[PDB]
Design a binder for this molecule. Structure first.
Ligand SMILES: *[C@@H]1O[C@H](CO)[C@@H](O)[C@H](O)[C@H]1NC(C)=O
Ligand SMILES: *[C@@H]1O[C@H](CO)[C@@H](O)[C@H](O)[C@H]1NC(C)=O
Ligand SMILES: *[C@@H]1O[C@H](CO)[C@@H](O)[C@H](O)[C@H]1NC(C)=O
Ligand SMILES: *[C@@H]1O[C@H](CO)[C@@H](O)[C@H](O)[C@H]1NC(C)=O
Ligand SMILES: *[C@@H]1O[C@H](CO)[C@@H](O)[C@H](O)[C@H]1NC(C)=O
Ligand SMILES: *[C@@H]1O[C@H](CO)[C@@H](O)[C@H](O)[C@H]1NC(C)=O
Ligand SMILES: *[C@@H]1O[C@H](CO)[C@@H](O)[C@H](O)[C@H]1NC(C)=O
Ligand SMILES: *[C@@H]1O[C@H](CO)[C@@H](O)[C@H](O)[C@H]1NC(C)=O
Ligand SMILES: *[C@@H]1O[C@H](CO)[C@@H](O)[C@H](O)[C@H]1NC(C)=O
Ligand SMILES: *[C@@H]1O[C@H](CO)[C@@H](O)[C@H](O)[C@H]1NC(C)=O
Ligand SMILES: *[C@@H]1O[C@H](CO)[C@@H](O)[C@H](O)[C@H]1NC(C)=O
Ligand SMILES: *[C@@H]1O[C@H](CO)[C@@H](O)[C@H](O)[C@H]1NC(C)=O
Lengths: 167, 420, 198
């Protein structure tokens, strides 16, 4: 049973006749040492994804890297619910979301120009002075013409199977 | 047995008999709608081969299927994000409720969030979240808007609704008492505002009773949220099938790539590697196609949910059976795991009573047709009442209009109109 | 970046066509991608298997392309149905659906021709410059409650007026814009006032 993984100590009970082990997804996660009688849990090796948060090239060339599903110990640094963002600083102020990251974390290029990380603000706070004897009637108006793009069709193509496969 | 289509009934139809209701009841319904799914990511190479340079080089001879599937999954994730974005993030400013809950008798404390908890969710939202219950290349991406942010959006929508009616969707939020808001809602379906101004206590009691019944039903029955659980189960079954499709041989010696590489030399194991690659690629393509179809279905559902939000919460729609069954009055959104829950407050007339009707009345040769209402009679006297509420009024010249003679209308009765 | 959706659709179609025409440079496990070179070099028996593998690969690629194109066509059909409904309900009329033809009270729409699409000019009514006022559900003049037919009882501090619900137009309280139904002590919040009779 070959493979790569982190061989650690397990807290399970192997029966005297059992040697190997498996999980719910038909994967070997624990084995028994040939020489000794210790139980070695086979945890998978550290892996994940790489995401590069970068602004426009006309602005600057500074970039950040986001490793998905890491604890900032298996790869300035900050721990989020989507991974570790190495390359940006976590500020304590809330701004509008510019570059989505995950779990409410957003990024934006602010001025000392550097990439930062913050929690997105859903909007400006407001509190209408509600009362049982108070009403607000508008005294003016403004006509605002808006636009809306809607696709109606696309290019009509046709690929001949014969000329495509067997030319 | 044979299923019954419903109870049998025969409406007592005639030409001089109309049924006008004398009472009503407030009915708060519940409609569950899926909005988004779990954003999953399937590493193509890691799933097909898995930390195998030779197998990856052999897979690279198939073209750009890896990039196609990765782009499809990224598009699905962006679509699931924009769905909930366009569904919930519709208001510009975040509103809050005043500390003095002087709503004319209506109790919204069960749908408004309470600060005595980490996540600012109401009791209904807590019930909904409590009822709904790394790998070999499989990883789930977290959503952009968290549950707390969705709850804050729903709370802002609820506050703006309670404080403005429908003005917070067109322009700016305008303060207005909830009594006058409900009066406008009633006037928007055909019932005059005096009915509300006289039965506000009864209407508030009926609304509180409906809210309590909804709470009891959500606390008792666990199968309320059906479509959300169905979508979750479908996604779970798809993931489980995609995982279990790795234990198949597809005509090879074994399903273990490392064991194949350790037992056979590359020249003899190339065939087994190709068989495994083809099988896993076909399985992954089938999974991606089914996921695209399900994502299109969820996009349609999210568009429907956003339309219902904009036409029921931000305004009173006149579409029949759109904002719940009955005469729509108002709606309250409620956050749900990967979905949205609406509380459609409808107007249902009750206590029907049949009377005698007539198209018009001929007082002095000229016919008199009612402006807004129907001519009814309790046996001896004729009155003009509303269409959805029995309110008999004396027939005067201000309630009817004259148009021509009364020798062309079939069914007109003789009466004596009053001149104020 | 105004016409973003049409440009995205065009780019997706172009990328699909490019992927379809580039999937011919892959051998899918064969000797080479060129069929003439295989037919020239390899003997007929092995060339049959090579042609079979190339045909299987190209057919799988074409089926994937056709499936993606069918999904894209279904999406375009949904978008076109939405656009046609919007046209029929806002260009040929005046819709009352909120947030369906613009943010605000819909007035009219003007369609514009766009490459593989359509653009609408939603003219909407947006109120502005609001002002705080004090309201009341009804008023009692001679013991009978007076409810406004179409309007809202507003007051500037000393005098009560009935104005519209979307434009402040103060008018004197007369018996022509109000209807009487009931008494004073039947509604909570009624304020004593005077009703004018022309
Ligand atoms: C990451 O580190 C924190 C800090 O000790 C710990 O609480 C958490 O469990 C770690 N994550 C995992 C997946 O173990
Ligand atoms: C209403 O606003 C317009 C500009 O949008 C302005 O020209 C006009 O004078 C305003 N009317 C009043 C009564 O303030
Ligand atoms: C209408 O029904 C309610 C019960 O839902 C009742 O309390 C009320 O008295 C009824 N109204 C009349 C006029 O009987
Ligand atoms: C609303 O109901 C809750 C419990 O049902 C109660 O504690 C509260 O006092 C009620 N508020 C009003 C204004 O009726
Ligand atoms: C209502 O229907 C009942 C039963 O059909 C009938 O007895 C009664 O006379 C009807 N009412 C009127 C006003 O005709
Ligand atoms: C009909 O109503 C009028 C006024 O409400 C009353 O005088 C009359 O007695 C009623 N007739 C019957 C048959 O109930
Ligand atoms: C209603 O129908 C009955 C039976 O067809 C008929 O005798 C009567 O004259 C009709 N009345 C009117 C007002 O049409
Ligand atoms: C109403 O009065 C006219 C007056 O001549 C009469 O011809 C007609 O028959 C009357 N209507 C009924 C229903 O009796
Ligand atoms: C109305 O009163 C509130 C609170 O007193 C204030 O914030 C607002 O500016 C006033 N005017 C309008 C038009 O809302
Ligand atoms: C309102 O006026 C009526 C008489 O028109 C009087 O009986 C009543 O007491 C008045 N109410 C108040 C609050 O002044
Ligand atoms: C309210 O309006 C009336 C009539 O326009 C005026 O006579 C009165 O002085 C106004 N009061 C205030 C406080 O503006
Ligand atoms: C409005 O509520 C206040 C309590 O804050 C109360 O004192 C006042 O009487 C109420 N007004 C009406 C018209 O009910």
């Amino acid at each position: 049973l070959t493979g790569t993984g982190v061989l650690t100590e397990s807290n399970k009970k192997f029966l005297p006749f059992q040697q190997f082990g498996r999980d719910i997804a038909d994967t070997t996660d624990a084995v028994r040492d040939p020489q000794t009688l210790e139980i070695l849990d086979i945890t998978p090796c550290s892996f994940g994804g790489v995401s590069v948060i970068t602004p426009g090239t006309n602005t600057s060339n500074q970039v950040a890297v986001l490793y998905q599903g890491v604890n900032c110990t298996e790869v300035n640094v900050f721990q989020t619910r989507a991974g570790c963002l190495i390359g940006a600083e976590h500020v304590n102020n809330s701004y509008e979301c510019d570059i989505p990251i995950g779990a409410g974390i957003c990024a934006s290029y602010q001025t000392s120009q550097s990439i930062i990380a913050y929690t997105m603000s859903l909007g400006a706070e407001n509190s209408v002075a509600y009362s049982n004897n108070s009403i607000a009637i508008p005294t003016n108006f403004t006509i605002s013409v808006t636009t809306e793009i809607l696709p109606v069709s696309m290019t009509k193509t046709s690929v001949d199977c014969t000329m495509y496969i067997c030319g | 047995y044979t299923m019954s289509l419903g109870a049998e009934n025969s409406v007592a139809y005639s030409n001089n008999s109309i049924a006008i209701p004398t009472n009503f009841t407030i009915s708060v319904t519940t409609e569950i709608l899926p909005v988004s799914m779990t954003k999953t990511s399937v590493d193509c190479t890691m799933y097909i081969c898995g930390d195998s340079t030779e197998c990856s080089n052999l897979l690279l001879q198939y073209g750009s299927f890896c990039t196609q599937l990765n782009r499809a999954l990224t598009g699905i994730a962006v679509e699931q994000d924009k769905n909930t974005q366009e569904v919930f993030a519709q208001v510009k400013q975040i509103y809050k409720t005043p500390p003095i809950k002087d709503f004319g008798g209506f109790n919204f404390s069960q749908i408004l969030p309470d600060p005595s908890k980490p996540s600012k969710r109401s009791f209904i939202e807590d019930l909904l979240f409590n009822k709904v219950t790394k790998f070999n290349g499989l990883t789930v991406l977290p959503p952009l808007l968290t549950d707390e942010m969705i709850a804050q959006y729903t709370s802002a929508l609820l506050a703006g609704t309670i404080t403005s009616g429908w003005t917070f969707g067109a322009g700016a939020a305008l303060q207005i008492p909830f009594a006058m808001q409900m009066a406008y809602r009633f006037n928007g379906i055909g019932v005059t505002q005096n009915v509300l101004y006289e039965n506000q206590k009864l209407i508030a009691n009926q609304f509180n009773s409906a809210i309590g019944k909804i709470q009891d039903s959500l606390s008792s029955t666990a199968s309320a949220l059906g479509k959300l659980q169905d979508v979750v189960n479908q996604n779970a079954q798809a993931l489980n099938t995609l995982v279990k499709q790795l234990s198949s041989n597809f005509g090879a010696i074994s399903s273990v790539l490392n064991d194949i590489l350790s037992r056979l030399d590359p020249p003899e194991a190339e065939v087994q590697i190709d068989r495994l690659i083809t099988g896993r690629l076909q399985s992954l393509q089938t999974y991606v196609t089914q996921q695209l179809i399900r994502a299109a279905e969820i996009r349609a559902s999210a568009n429907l949910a956003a339309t219902k939000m904009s036409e029921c919460v931000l305004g009173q729609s006149k579409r029949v059976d759109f904002c719940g069954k009955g005469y729509h009055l108002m709606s309250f959104p409620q956050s749900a795991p990967h979905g949205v829950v609406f509380l459609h407050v409808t107007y249902v007339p009750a206590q029907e009573k049949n009377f005698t009707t007539a198209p018009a009345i001929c007082h002095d040769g000229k016919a008199h047709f009612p402006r807004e209402g129907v001519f009814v009679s309790n046996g001896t006297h004729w009155f003009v009442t509303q269409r959805n509420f029995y309110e008999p009024q004396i027939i005067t010249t201000d309630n009817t209009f004259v148009s021509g003679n009364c020798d062309v209308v079939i069914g007109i009765v003789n009466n004596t109109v009053y001149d104020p």
